[PDB]
């Protein structure tokens, strides 16, 4: 996980970009790690485990996966 995080710096230490530069992608990979590891049996290595830092990606990724008163 730390190796992938360190990798996600070289392709970004040249300039900004819309959508995600360093913090959004870091939160995304941390959440992906924490969500994927809790499917084989292992203590959670990252705390928080909050909402998906980028939810629209779930829109494309294999929605059809396998009186008188």
């Amino acid at each position: 996980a730390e190796q992938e995080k360190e990798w996600a710096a070289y392709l970004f230490k040249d300039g900004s970009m819309i959508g995600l530069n360093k913090e959004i992608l870091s939160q995304y990979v941390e959440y992906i790690t924490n969500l994927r590891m809790q499917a084989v049996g292992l203590p959670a290595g990252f705390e928080g485990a909050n909402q998906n830092p980028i939810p629209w990606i779930n829109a494309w990724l294999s929605s059809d996966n396998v009186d008188f008163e």
């Binding site: 300039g15 900004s16 970009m17 819309i18 959508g19 995600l20 530069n21 913090e23 959004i24 909050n50 909402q51 830092p53 980028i54 939810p55 629209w56 009186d67 008188f68």
Partner: protein, 734 residues
């Protein structure tokens, strides 16, 4: 290339690659489930060279509030933060306003304010009071608030839109201006209470008072009344009056049920030139004039009695399909009704309409008594040689109800209940009309020309205290103990265009106030509207403010003299409005009388002579969004309210949506209007002036998806039984 933009100053900036997420992170610094990437991407903005960062903020906030729903209704606070940020930018550019002086002393000569505040206070205590308004509380609004605020709530040129104020200095500025004529020994320690009240959203204020405070044009009323009798000079005078008065934030209750029929002219000539049809065009064109102060367009509301020889044949004037002879659809028509007309319909009597001026002692008798009124009504049915028009009540009522269901704007006033519960004395000066919003009443005298003091028109002034933003009702007294006092200084401070309007409003000093939020307090209580658990649940605390506001008024006016016309009031006799109600059974929502403060009325008869009116219940539709409350007493259309106006499409949310997701009830889920009727009748137990009620149906719960004719008539009748106040929009649902 040269990826530059027009920055705040005008110089060519960078490519806006970085430093763009900084503002959205500043916004969502303590929120949750907010998709910063989505809102930064779903903006769908064009990136052409030659854009201004102000326009970029405008479009990103236009796209921010667009993507909102009950799924993630969280970053509306983010939209509000961005809004107040852009506002503070367009105000100064930086994020640090001056110390209340460099802004006030530097902009006083700009003419937007009144050139007396600086001459009414001291520079020394100015800075002392300045260190009490840290703007950190300004980050608690909603987008639905800042939207209307930037639209029309604060001082700004209506052609340039260059805003020159800040929603934080607003409250303290109005609280300082309202306390000018006061002893210089406690005002400094007294304004802080009012500021803490208004800033914490505990007390709500309308546009007429927040759109017009500290402004050179000193006008602060909310509604006015006027009635015209059979005279040309009177018609010219009232036309001049409506043309001149509506130009400053006015509300009109015009009444012209005493002009003429179509019988004849004595001294030779036509009767009335087709009657009221051409005459009402004058009033329609008059009310269609300059904006009411520069915020919106006013709309008056006329009235006429049902027994008019010109029958409901003119009532079609609000219908859509028809010739252009008489179809003036620009007003809110009104018709009068008493306790006998519905009885004549139930018995089946064919009502015979007649001419007002052709008979004597009938129009005033329509409001005065019953014996002489009935005797005359039958004596004419007996008198042959006078020209009338008879028709079965069924056809007339059916046409009226069809027109109401079609246009959805025809209002009806219950004159019988308009006197049997008013604090005035219905023996020397009864009521005759109501304002366009149908929540107030006061005597009115016609006039021959505006320059004469013979005539007299009246007005009022509103305010609102929240119900739900509190923790315990006990402190409410103190709250009241401020606001009415403040409201006192409001009366002797404003100006009056009509020379005759000054005397009546300086004498009676009529004043009524209400409430904004209703659903949040009911949900916090724990009862709904359908079953009826709220039929008496609101009689525990809400039944106490109406009786304890008089206590505050007495304690705050026991030494401020007396009302020059206090003798013309039923409450001036010695009986408090604690049991003077004509309920159906007086026990439909039976509960013990919680606060029978006879010492209050004792001290009132002793020396207590306060403002004539006490309170009211206004819908406060344009208001109540500054604090993000429920619009009036009516429940919301849904959990999230999608509203539309000339600005765009807004999406407001009800408070406590997270912890009370399913705790309210949508008006789409309440088919029985009997619950709403019982609720407003329970409110009738302590209402002072009136309530602006409303009904609504749904064609998805009828036989053939078509409206009925007796079920809604039954609802009207059971509303006429108990809890009998004005009517309003039919409010169908397409």
């Amino acid at each position: 290339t040269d990826l530059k933009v027009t920055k705040r100053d005008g110089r060519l900036e960078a490519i806006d690659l970085d430093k763009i997420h900084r503002v959205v992170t500043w916004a969502a610094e303590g929120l949750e489930n907010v998709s910063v990437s989505q809102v930064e991407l779903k903006s769908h903005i064009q990136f052409y060279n030659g854009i201004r960062t102000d326009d970029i903020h405008e479009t990103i906030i236009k796209a921010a509030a667009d993507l909102i729903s009950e799924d993630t209704p969280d970053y509306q606070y983010l939209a509000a933060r961005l809004a107040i940020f852009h506002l503070r930018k367009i105000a100064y550019g930086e994020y640090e306003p001056p110390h209340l002086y460099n802004h006030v002393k530097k902009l006083t000569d700009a003419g937007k304010y009144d050139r007396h505040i600086l001459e009414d206070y001291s520079r020394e205590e100015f800075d002392e009071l300045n260190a009490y308004i840290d703007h950190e509380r300004d980050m608690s609004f909603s987008y639905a608030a800042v939207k209307q605020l930037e639209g029309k709530y604060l001082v700004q040129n209506r052609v340039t839109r260059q805003i020159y104020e800040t929603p934080q200095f607003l409250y303290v500025l109005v609280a300082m201006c309202l306390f000018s004529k006061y002893p210089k020994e406690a005002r400094l320690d007294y304004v802080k209470r009012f500021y803490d009240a208004v800033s914490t959203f505990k007390v709500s204020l309308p546009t007429p008072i927040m759109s017009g405070v500290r402004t050179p044009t000193r006008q602060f009323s909310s509604c006015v009344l006027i009635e015209c009798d059979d005279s040309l000079d009177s018609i010219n005078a009232t036309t001049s009056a409506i043309v001149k008065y509506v130009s400053q934030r006015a509300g009109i209750g015009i009444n012209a049920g005493r002009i003429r029929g179509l019988d004849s002219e004595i001294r030779g000539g036509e009767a009335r030139h087709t009657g009221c049809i051409p005459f009402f065009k004058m009033f329609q064109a008059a009310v269609k004039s300059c904006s009411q102060g520069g915020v919106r367009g006013g709309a008056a509301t006329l009235f006429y009695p049902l027994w008019h020889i010109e029958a409901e044949s003119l009532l079609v004037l609000k219908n859509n399909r028809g010739v252009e002879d008489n179809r003036i659809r620009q007003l809110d028509y009104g018709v009068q009704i008493n306790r006998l007309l519905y009885t004549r319909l139930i018995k089946g009597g064919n009502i015979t309409l007649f001419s007002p001026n052709e008979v004597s002692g009938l129009y005033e008798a329509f409001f005065a008594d019953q014996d002489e009124f009935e005797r005359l009504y039958t004596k004419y049915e007996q008198d042959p040689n006078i020209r009338k028009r008879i028709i079965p009540a069924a056809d007339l009522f059916s046409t009226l109800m069809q027109e109401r269901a079609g246009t959805g704007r025809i209002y009806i006033q219950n004159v019988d209940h308009c006197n049997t519960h008013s604090p005035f004395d219905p023996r020397v000066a009864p009521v005759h009309q109501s304002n366009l919003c149908m929540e107030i009443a006061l005597p009115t005298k016609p006039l021959d020309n505006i320059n004469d003091p013979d005539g007299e028109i009246a007005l009022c002034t509103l305010s609102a205290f929240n119900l739900g933003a509190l923790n315990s009702l006990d402190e409410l007294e103190g709250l009241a103990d401020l606001t009415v006092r403040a409201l006192d200084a409001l009366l002797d401070y404003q100006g009056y265009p009509v020379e005759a309007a000054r005397t009546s409003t300086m004498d009676r000093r009529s004043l009524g106030i209400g409430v904004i939020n209703y659903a949040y307090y009911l949900a916090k209580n724990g009862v709904r509207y359908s079953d009826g658990s709220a039929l008496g649940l609101t009689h525990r605390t809400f039944e106490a403010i109406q009786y304890y506001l008089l206590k505050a008024s007495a304690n705050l006016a026991k030494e401020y003299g007396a009302c020059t016309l206090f003798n013309q009031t039923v409450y001036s006799q010695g009986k408090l409005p604690i049991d003077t109600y004509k309920k159906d059974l007086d026990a439909v929502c039976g509960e013990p009388l919680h606060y029978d403060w006879e010492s209050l009325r004792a001290d009132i008869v002793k020396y207590g002579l306060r403002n004539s009116t006490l309170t009211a219940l206004m819908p406060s539709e344009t208001s109540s969004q500054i604090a993000n409350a429920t619009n009036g007493i009516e429940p919301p259309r849904g959990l999230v309210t999608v509203k539309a106006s000339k600005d765009g499409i807004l999406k407001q949310v009800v408070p406590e949506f997270e912890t009370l997701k399913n705790a309210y009830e949508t008006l789409w889920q309440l088919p029985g209007n009997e619950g709403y009727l019982k609720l407003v009748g329970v409110m009738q137990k302590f209402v002072d002036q009136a309530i602006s009620a409303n009904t609504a149906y749904d064609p998805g719960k009828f036989e053939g998806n078509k409206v009925s004719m007796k079920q809604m008539l039954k609802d009207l009748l059971t509303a006429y039984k108990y809890g009998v106040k004005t009517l309003y929009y039919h409010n169908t649902r397409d």
